[PDB]
């Protein structure tokens, strides 16, 4: 009968970066989804495999909330079948994804006038990520035809780059907070239900 802690997810003070996105398991609660879609704060509310209006009528199990911060034009890369830096090396959604991608502008929280640098994205990986795979591993990688045996070769590229968030940046470069809700459709005795 108790409420699901969406306020600890959407209204959190700090979000982790997209390379180290935060995953929260939501279970044994009643989820009131009607305060999400009718809120005018979210610019992007795109649900795959479920309509957002019917979210109150279905009982799920093992609901996952994935929270991170990406810039403005990369919100389209949080979708099944997309390519880019975020989809390949930072956060990959499966082709059979069911759930909802919610994203809203957070320039007045996540931008500082000198430049906010608390948010990182991985620039390169040897292979694309598997879906729902987290790469917090920061490893020095090479450049080509010379090994990284110290300084001596071509100098060694770093995988994680920080976003340059200033509030004077135009929209599209501005911080957008992304929460991805992921469900499973009625395979076990369900724990997460609507009213």
């Amino acid at each position, epitope marked *: 009968t108790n409420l699901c802690p969406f306020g600890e997810v959407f209204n959190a003070t700090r979000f982790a970066s997209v390379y180290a996105w935060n995953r929260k398991r939501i279970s044994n609660c009643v989820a009131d989804y009607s305060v999400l879609y009718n809120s005018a704060s979210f610019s992007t509310f795109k649900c795959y495999g479920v309509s957002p209006t019917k979210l109150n009528d279905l009982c799920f199990t093992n609901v996952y909330a994935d929270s991170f911060v990406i810039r403005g034009d990369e919100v389209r890369q949080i979708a099944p079948g997309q390519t880019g830096k975020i989809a390949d090396y930072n956060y990959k959604l499966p082709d059979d994804f069911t759930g909802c991608v919610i994203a809203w502008n957070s320039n007045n929280l996540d931008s500082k006038v000198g430049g906010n640098y608390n948010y*990182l994205y991985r620039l390169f990986r040897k292979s694309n990520l598997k879906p729902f795979e987290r790469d917090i591993s920061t490893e020095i990688y090479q450049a080509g035809s010379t090994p990284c045996n110290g300084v001596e070769g071509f100098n060694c590229y770093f995988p994680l780059q920080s976003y340059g968030f200033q509030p004077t940046n135009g929209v599209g470069y501005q911080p957008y907070r992304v929460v991805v809700l992921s469900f499973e459709l009625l395979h076990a005795p369900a724990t997460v239900c609507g009213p």
Partner: nanobody
Amino acid sequence: EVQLVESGGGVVQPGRSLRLSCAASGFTFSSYAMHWVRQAPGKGLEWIGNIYHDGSTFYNPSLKSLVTISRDDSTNTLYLQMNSLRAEDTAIYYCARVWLYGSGYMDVWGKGTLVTVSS
């Protein structure tokens, strides 16, 4: 010209602190992000920490609370505080510099400092 110089290495007791300094000369220290790297003899390079103009410090998840990266921008310097030294931290340390407006190429490197720990 562009130059990174380091200081602070030596032979010290384990558990005693160290303060390694990386002075930058010839370029403005802003708009570049600074890295600390170490390598052990017989081992490859291991990245330690990043710090930006904001003061955002990012550490290696492998080693926790042993180091503390401290940037200073009045005199274009970078400090590393190392606390509670273990025997395996015998390493050559390097100061690295990336441009924030390109790929993560580390451009020029420090020549390095030698840290030898023993009892």
